Amino acid sequence: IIEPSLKALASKYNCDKSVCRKCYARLPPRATNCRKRKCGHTNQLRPKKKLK
Amino acid sequence: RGITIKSTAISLYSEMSDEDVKEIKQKTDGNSFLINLIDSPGHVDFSSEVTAALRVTDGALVVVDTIEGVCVQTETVLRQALGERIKPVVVINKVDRALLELQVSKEDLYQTFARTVESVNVIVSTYADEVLGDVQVYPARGTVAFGSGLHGWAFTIRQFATRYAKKFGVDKAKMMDRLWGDSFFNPKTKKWTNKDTDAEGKPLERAFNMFILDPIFRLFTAIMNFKKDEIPVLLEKLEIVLKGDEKDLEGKALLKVVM
Amino acid sequence: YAGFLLADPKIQEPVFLVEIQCPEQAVGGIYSVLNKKRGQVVSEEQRPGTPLFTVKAYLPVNESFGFTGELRQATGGQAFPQMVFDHWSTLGSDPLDPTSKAGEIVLAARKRHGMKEEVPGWQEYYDKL
Amino acid sequence: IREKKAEYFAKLREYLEEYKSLFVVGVDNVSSQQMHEVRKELRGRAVVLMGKNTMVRRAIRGFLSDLPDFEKLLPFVKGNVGFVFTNEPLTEIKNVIVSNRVAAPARAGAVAPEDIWVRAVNTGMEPGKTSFFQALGVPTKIARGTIEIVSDVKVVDAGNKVGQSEASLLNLLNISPFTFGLTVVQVYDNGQVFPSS
Amino acid sequence: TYMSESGEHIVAGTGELHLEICLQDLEHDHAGVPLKISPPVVAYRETVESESSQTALSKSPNKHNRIYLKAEPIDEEVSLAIENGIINPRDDFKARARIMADDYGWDVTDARKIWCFGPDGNGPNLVID
Amino acid sequence: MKYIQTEQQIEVPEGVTVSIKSRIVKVVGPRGTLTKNLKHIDVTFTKVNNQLIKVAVHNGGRKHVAALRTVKSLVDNMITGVTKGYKYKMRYVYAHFPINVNIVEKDGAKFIEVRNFLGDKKIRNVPVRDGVTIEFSTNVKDEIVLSGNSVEDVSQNAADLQQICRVRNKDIRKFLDGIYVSHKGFITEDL
Amino acid sequence: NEVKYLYLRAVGGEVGASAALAPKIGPLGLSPKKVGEDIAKATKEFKGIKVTVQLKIQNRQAAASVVPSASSLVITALKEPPRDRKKDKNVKHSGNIQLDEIIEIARQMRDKSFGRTLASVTKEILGTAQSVGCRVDFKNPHDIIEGINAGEIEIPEN
RNA sequence: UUCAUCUAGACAGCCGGACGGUGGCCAUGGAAGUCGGAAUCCGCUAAGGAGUGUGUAACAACUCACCGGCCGAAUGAACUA
Ligand SMILES: CO[C@H]1[C@@H](O)[C@H](O)[C@H](OC[C@@]23C[C@@H]4[C@H](C)CC[C@H]4[C@@]4(C=O)C[C@@H]2C[C@H](C(C)C)[C@@]34C(=O)O)O[C@@H]1C
Ligand SMILES: Nc1nc2c(ncn2[C@@H]2O[C@H](COP(=O)(O)OP(=O)(O)OP(=O)(O)O)[C@@H](O)[C@H]2O)c(=O)[nH]1
Ligand SMILES: [Mg+2]
Ligand SMILES: [Mg+2]
Ligand SMILES: [Mg+2]
Numbered sequence A: 001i002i003e004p005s006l007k008a009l010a011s012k013y014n015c016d017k018s019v020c021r022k023c024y025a026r027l028p029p030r031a032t033n034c035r036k037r038k039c040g041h042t043n044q045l046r047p048k049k050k051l052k
Numbered sequence B: 001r002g003i004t005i006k007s008t009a010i011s012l013y014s015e016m017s018d019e020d021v022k023e024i025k026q027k028t029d030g031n032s033f034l035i036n037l038i039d040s041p042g043h044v045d046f047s048s049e050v051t052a053a054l055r056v057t058d059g060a061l062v063v064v065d066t067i068e069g070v071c072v073q074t075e076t077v078l079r080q081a082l083g084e085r086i087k088p089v090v091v092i093n094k095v096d097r098a099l100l101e102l103q104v105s106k107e108d109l110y111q112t113f114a115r116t117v118e119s120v121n122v123i124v125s126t127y128a129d130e131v132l133g134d135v136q137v138y139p140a141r142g143t144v145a146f147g148s149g150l151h152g153w154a155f156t157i158r159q160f161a162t163r164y165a166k167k168f169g170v171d172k173a174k175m176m177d178r179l180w181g182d183s184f185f186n187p188k189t190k191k192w193t194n195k196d197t198d199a200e201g202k203p204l205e206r207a208f209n210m211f212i213l214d215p216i217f218r219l220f221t222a223i224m225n226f227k228k229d230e231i232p233v234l235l236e237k238l239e240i241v242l243k244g245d246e247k248d249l250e251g252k253a254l255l256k257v258v259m
Numbered sequence C: 001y002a003g004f005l006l007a008d009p010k011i012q013e014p015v016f017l018v019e020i021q022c023p024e025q026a027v028g029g030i031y032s033v034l035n036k037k038r039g040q041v042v043s044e045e046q047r048p049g050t051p052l053f054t055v056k057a058y059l060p061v062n063e064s065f066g067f068t069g070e071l072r073q074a075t076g077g078q079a080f081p082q083m084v085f086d087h088w089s090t091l092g093s094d095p096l097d098p099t100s101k102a103g104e105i106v107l108a109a110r111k112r113h114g115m116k117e118e119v120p121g122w123q124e125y126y127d128k129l
Numbered sequence D: 001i002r003e004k005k006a007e008y009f010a011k012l013r014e015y016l017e018e019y020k021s022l023f024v025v026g027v028d029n030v031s032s033q034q035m036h037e038v039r040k041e042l043r044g045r046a047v048v049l050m051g052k053n054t055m056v057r058r059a060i061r062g063f064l065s066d067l068p069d070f071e072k073l074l075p076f077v078k079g080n081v082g083f084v085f086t087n088e089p090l091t092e093i094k095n096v097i098v099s100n101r102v103a104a105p106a107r108a109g110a111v112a113p114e115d116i117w118v119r120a121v122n123t124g125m126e127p128g129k130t131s132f133f134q135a136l137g138v139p140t141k142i143a144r145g146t147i148e149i150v151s152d153v154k155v156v157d158a159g160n161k162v163g164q165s166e167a168s169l170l171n172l173l174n175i176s177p178f179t180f181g182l183t184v185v186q187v188y189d190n191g192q193v194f195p196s197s
Numbered sequence E: 001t002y003m004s005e006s007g008e009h010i011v012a013g014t015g016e017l018h019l020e021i022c023l024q025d026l027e028h029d030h031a032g033v034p035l036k037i038s039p040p041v042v043a044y045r046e047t048v049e050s051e052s053s054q055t056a057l058s059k060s061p062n063k064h065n066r067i068y069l070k071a072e073p074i075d076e077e078v079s080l081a082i083e084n085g086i087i088n089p090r091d092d093f094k095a096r097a098r099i100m101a102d103d104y105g106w107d108v109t110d111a112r113k114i115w116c117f118g119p120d121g122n123g124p125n126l127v128i129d
Numbered sequence F: 001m002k003y004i005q006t007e008q009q010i011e012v013p014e015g016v017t018v019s020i021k022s023r024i025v026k027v028v029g030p031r032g033t034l035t036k037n038l039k040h041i042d043v044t045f046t047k048v049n050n051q052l053i054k055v056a057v058h059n060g061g062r063k064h065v066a067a068l069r070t071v072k073s074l075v076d077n078m079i080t081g082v083t084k085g086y087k088y089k090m091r092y093v094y095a096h097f098p099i100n101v102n103i104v105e106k107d108g109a110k111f112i113e114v115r116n117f118l119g120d121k122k123i124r125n126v127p128v129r130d131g132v133t134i135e136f137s138t139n140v141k142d143e144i145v146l147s148g149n150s151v152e153d154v155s156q157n158a159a160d161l162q163q164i165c166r167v168r169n170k171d172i173r174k175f176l177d178g179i180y181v182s183h184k185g186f187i188t189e190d191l
Numbered sequence G: 001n002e003v004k005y006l007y008l009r010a011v012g013g014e015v016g017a018s019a020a021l022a023p024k025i026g027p028l029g030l031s032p033k034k035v036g037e038d039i040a041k042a043t044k045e046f047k048g049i050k051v052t053v054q055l056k057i058q059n060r061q062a063a064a065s066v067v068p069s070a071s072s073l074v075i076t077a078l079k080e081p082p083r084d085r086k087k088d089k090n091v092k093h094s095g096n097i098q099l100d101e102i103i104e105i106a107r108q109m110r111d112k113s114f115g116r117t118l119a120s121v122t123k124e125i126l127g128t129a130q131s132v133g134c135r136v137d138f139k140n141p142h143d144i145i146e147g148i149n150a151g152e153i154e155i156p157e158n
Numbered sequence H: 001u002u003c004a005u006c007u008a009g010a011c012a013g014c015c016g017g018a019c020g021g022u023g024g025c026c027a028u029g030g031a032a033g034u035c036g037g038a039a040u041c042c043g044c045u046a047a048g049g050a051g052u053g054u055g056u057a058a059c060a061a062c063u064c065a066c067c068g069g070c071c072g073a074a075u076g077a078a079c080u081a
């Protein structure tokens, strides 16, 4: 098991993320456009699905 | 498969010493005991044969992993024992696993035991009817043993409380309950303090880690780090015997023989 | 047969009554499984002193295959179910439409029994007058 | 928009030229419930007006022409503060003003003014809550069906913010290092400001 | 272990792993014969949910006999009474109808004109004159 | 949109000297000396009063003036790095297997060795770039501290430790093992 | 012998069950069945409407005292000839109840309500009736509200 | 191109509050802002929706609209090619 603070720290990098709908790119949680050129920097983003 | 699917009876004969028969709060006569031991299955899919086992028995050996702690089945199997009014004794197993895998340095092992007993005692406290009251399991009183079944070694706080009387001449009745919990030997002062007190700097270690876990840690450290020049120094200090070929054994296999 | 086939024929399923001994934390998993299998939660209870709940519900026998394994999976092995037949519940859907929810289970029954696939209509067993 | 602001300017004008004194009471960490209680206590006795510091300064500055006396107020209108217009004995007003101390709950990630020590006394909560105690390392022995902490353990130090797990247990045990009150800043009275104390 | 209502031997167990071991013992040592396992066949009850909108008729093969009847949804509580022994086929008409009329709202004349219970002579289906 | 003149301000404290060639910036302070090559940016430095530098872009586009502000950030990072320093605090996150991280030497290269990550028998090695100081701080459990003058070097070496401990073939939402920067600040406290 | 507090929402006139007692009345052990009949005695006045039930349980002397509530009182002010919950789901709560009870109901509300003037508390309690859907003085409750704000239904400031 | 916020302090940033009637009505086995239908109210208000989401079996507990504290000059939105 992980301490709550260390689990929050690890989640800040592994879970607290956005995902592009078009190319599945992992983006910052406050991003408005995907950084990838393949999707044309589309604004279609979702939050990264939380476990369970 | 590697699992237990049934409940098979086995009979055991046990001789003891006179000194610990006196340390019995039960009307008894003699020096020998006969054990009728049942090996219940752990799976919930076989949780009916343990009910059959519990009805046919009066005591329960609650084996608990120090790694996984109190699991769902330990919750369940102990609940049915308490429903049958079975007095449980708890043994903490897989301490060897924690000492090679988790690398717990000095206090984490004590805290895992502390958390384990608290979680176990919670189970017996809420599922016990008011006919015994003192059915809580507690290591200083000698109702909890510690060891690794796979390696074939285990100990109790009572066992160490008597082991030091033969070498130090100190009291055992008030050290059996003293070697657990918040108790610090406080070297350089010769006073069993009851708190950290910061040790006026460098907060000191408790009696449990200092007196009980320290010797087994030292044997683990020496054997697993292959300090062949240091192994026999402890072994004679640890009053063991030698054989023609077990001395010619390396680390990870010494634990087999020495403990 | 003609009288039966005109009075909106329907089928009835057996439903189990299940009481489950689950702790405080995993009682939510029971409802998740029950909502998968059309189960109807009847009553909640607390055993005095212990956190173990006691949830009684009506689980249809048809949707009761593998129920405990998924129930164990959702509750982490903490749910302990006891299962026994309670009564019969009528299926609201028509068992005459082969594509209906009741029509598929009766269709399977017809096939495995060696009967015909389509059921003889009310025009049979009825003499026109 | 300037319209709605202008009644507040007008309402501020009305209040200031009716009552004789006011406070510069410092409103920090004060709940909506806390403010209503204080105001409810002061019914009739005094009224409390708090708003956007910028307008408050602005409103006064336009009033200064007709009402120079209030000029001294401006340098003390800083931070979240409210004006308690009163025409009643200052002594009793200040007591009622700083009266509503409330032990605020132990928030997660909240700065701890002092150390947080938990005691080995019994708590009465059933052994079910033992999960919270174990999480924070705190030893606990069950006695008379109640969670009894074995040994004194400090969960939160001084300064270091109270973590989520730490806070959780404190809320359960009703422990909190901070209690908030509508502390004051300055007392203007008839044309003179002076330290409230 | 028991015999189902659909003519199938139904071994029951605590869980999937427990059942797997029990079946393995059955196939290897207990019985000693190769056997196959499938999900049990769930039995259902056919019923009606209307009043036989138009009168059902059937004519005899010799064209001399005609029967006109209807179907009706016997109430749930009455169905339990037949199965639970409140309404006994062995009982006396115009005496068993005293219980059947006052406790179940039916009219005495139809209650008295009862010919049989179905199926098995004591089932929850009724025939009325 | 071709701003005629866009300007940014670089504040120079008393105890540091900034020597700027065409686009070679050399910042010398109490803690050390940093150098950065900026010949790819086409900007203009000019000192005003020996504690203030002005960097300007003339007739620059949106992208040109956007990187002008970046130059100010890069130079200020150099200046604050020789006065206050940089320290990045990283915590070890592990559910079951404790991560064994220490300092190992191979041909005098100051490698950070990683063992027992998720029980792996692989030995991960992270080189320490010159200028980065590695210390494990006691009274904080599972803490590695990286200190140095340049934020670029300190942050990237912290990132190398983080990237070498990425979980493969598992649900990263549950297998949260790794080494993550828990704090990013300066060597000197409360400066 | 300390005064613990508990709150419930048991329907008026009808008894309650251990299902919502044992989680709280279980540790202290006040014989849940005994508690339930106390609740009925409390609710006895308030037949047919859910009401809060104060429990000053000072070592098994449960209060069984109905805590007043705007909603229940407005329903209790309609006099609501006893609702048959079983017969039909989604029964209504309507009527024509006048100003006077709202003045009355407000009176035991002003104590805790922050509506310094009775006019404030009355439009509060009357505001609850707007949610209920009943009528006041044959007119929309919000029409009565705006009628009060225009000074024609002036409240006795007692 | 159009419409908005803005020194009576705009956007962003960080921090504080986010109430009371009230667990609004009805339903629900449980539904307390947050499974649902409908009602989209009042008071205190600088301000708070019969609620923005997370969340609980149901509570709770955070969170957001909403209003403030710090800084002080521009900013935001929707479209056009
Ligand atoms: C407590 O012990 C009981 C209960 O577990 C449960 O009632 C079940 O009973 C079997 C069934 C009994 C049902 C009623 C008699 C009417 C319909 C019967 C079933 C379906 O056809 C439902 C359960 C499950 C069995 C089918 C699906 C094979 C039943 C059967 O016997 O056929 O198993 C044993 C006998
Ligand atoms: N490392 C280590 N492993 C242990 C220890 N004790 C038990 N184990 C492991 O746990 C497994 C299960 O223990 P067993 O005694 O063999 O059987 P069991 O515990 O009864 O398991 P079931 O029969 O399924 O109930 C063994 O295969 C061991 O590998 C221990 O002390 N140390
Ligand atoms: Mg076994
Ligand atoms: Mg996989
Ligand atoms: Mg909900």
Ligand SMILES: [Zn+2]
Binding pocket: A020, A021, A022, A023, A024, A025, A034, A035, A036, A039, A042
């Ligand atoms: Zn993309």
